[PDB]
Symmetry: C2
Subunit: 257 residues, 2 copies
């Protein structure tokens, strides 16, 4: 509720974000824009085969990539969970609620941060050692030629706000501490925390992007688009489960819906 | 420009009063007993009130909704700058906007136990609405759940007038030809809305943020309604009547 308290809250979260997420947006942009480090580019199947001898990927093609993308998701859930521990008040909440906040929250956060790794033309993979193009992913077979595209569409819009990491660290906390999750036992203390985080985000954006009229409101409006991407991904995953499939214990739990 | 924001705000509340016959203030007075409405809680109650059922109620809610679209279209005329936008862009904004607004404004007629109907001359219970045939009676409850959360923000008409304008001027609707002027207008509205909530609810921390957060839930509920409406079109044949009427009320 005090300006210096809010700046303090912001530094705390930026700190834990740096410590919890190995690839920041600043590091990714440096790789993406050529600033002094350059990735191997995957645009076709021969490039894909060429990639393994260069990067440590692959841990039928469209399947190896989907499963590889899912294995990457398990890491993302782990990093997000670590970051969330350090949000003031989160570990004090009721255990069930802590679990529920993570249940719905991780996917919206993965896609928020996946935007840090993308441009119009493709996405960084394997901790920035590779770069897979959108048209290659778009051209994958069966239902897999479509799981990545709506992420690209969001990112292009999302990256237009030019947020930096110190902006994102607070935004991510706001996503987790949302009292509208299905099944929360005690909404009042969850919401109380978000008043603090929203207050910090409001000031952080005013200071960091003072020329950006209504960035705060515009950034919150983006939570609408995040929700829509998660709906589609959960549905496309119930289709794979019945066709081939054959899901990490972490992924098994987040997929109860 | 604080005076500009208070000026913009009083303008819309003025126009909103003139465009929408049943305000939230007026509806809340009727809900609380502060002329009592006819209450529909069962099937015999329905037959007596006017002077297959689940379809008659759905069709009745749509005919009512189409009346509100004309009222919303008129209110949008009064948003400063809106009539100067490209006509194509105006149609597109209303096309995608009306649903979110109809749901926003439906919450003013709603409480835990039911909803005002026919300009406040009736009251339909939620316990009646919850229990309808499998396809129907399931498009309703998510509205009630939304409203209760929404009505907990305790907004009044002068808040909603600006909130409604904000929905209308969303520069992300598919097919917009010229987004800059739409967004420039929406900046003014958000500034005006922000000021409105601080003055009106000086004790309500971060209400502005909380209200914008609700637009996430509005989009999700409209999506679901758009989905259930693709199901009735292919499954329910009795929803035919005059071909002209299907033409009038399809939207
Ligand atoms: O080193 C590896 O084995 C490997 C390492 C990474 C990938 C891979 N990750 N990914 C992502 O989308 C991703 C990223 Cl890049 C970072 C964090 C979270 C994600 C998440 F959304 F999947 F959860 C992809 C998309 C498309 C194609 C390949 C990949 C694949 C393989
Ligand atoms: O003012 C009125 O007479 C009135 C006005 C609205 C309702 C009402 N409509 N509704 C719908 O789901 C609905 C339907 Cl079913 C068809 C088309 C459009 C809608 C819409 F309003 F949501 F947009 C509801 C659900 C739950 C509770 C009350 C209602 C009822 C009465």
């Amino acid at each position: 509720m005090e300006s210096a308290d809010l700046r303090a809250l912001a530094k705390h979260l930026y700190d834990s974000y740096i410590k919890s997420f190995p690839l920041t947006k600043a590091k990714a942009r440096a790789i993406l824009t050529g600033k002094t480090k350059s990735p191997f580019v995957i645009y076709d199947m021969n490039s894909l085969m060429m990639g393994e001898d260069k990067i440590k990927f692959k841990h039928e093609v469209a399947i190896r990539i989907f499963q590889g993308c899912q294995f990457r998701s398990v890491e993302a859930v782990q990093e997000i969970t670590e970051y969330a521990k350090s949000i003031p008040g989160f570990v004090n909440l009721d255990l069930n609620d802590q679990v529920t906040l993570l249940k719905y929250g991780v996917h919206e956060i993965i896609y928020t941060m996946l935007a840090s790794l993308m441009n119009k033309d493709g996405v960084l993979i394997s901790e920035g050692q590779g770069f897979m193009t959108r048209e290659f992913l778009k051209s994958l077979r069966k239902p897999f030629g479509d799981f990545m595209e709506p992420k690209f569409e969001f990112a292009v819009k999302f990256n237009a706000l030019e947020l930096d990491d110190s902006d994102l660290a607070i935004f991510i906390a706001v996503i987790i501490l949302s009292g509208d999750r299905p099944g929360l036992l005690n909404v009042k203390p969850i919401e109380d925390i978000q008043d603090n985080l929203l207050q910090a985000l409001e000031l952080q954006l005013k200071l960091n992007h003072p020329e950006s009229s209504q960035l705060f409101a515009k950034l919150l409006q983006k939570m609408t688009d995040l929700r829509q991407i998660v709906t589609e991904h959960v549905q496309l995953l119930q289709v794979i489960k019945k066709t081939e499939t054959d899901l990490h214990p972490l992924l098994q739990e987040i997929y109860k819906d």
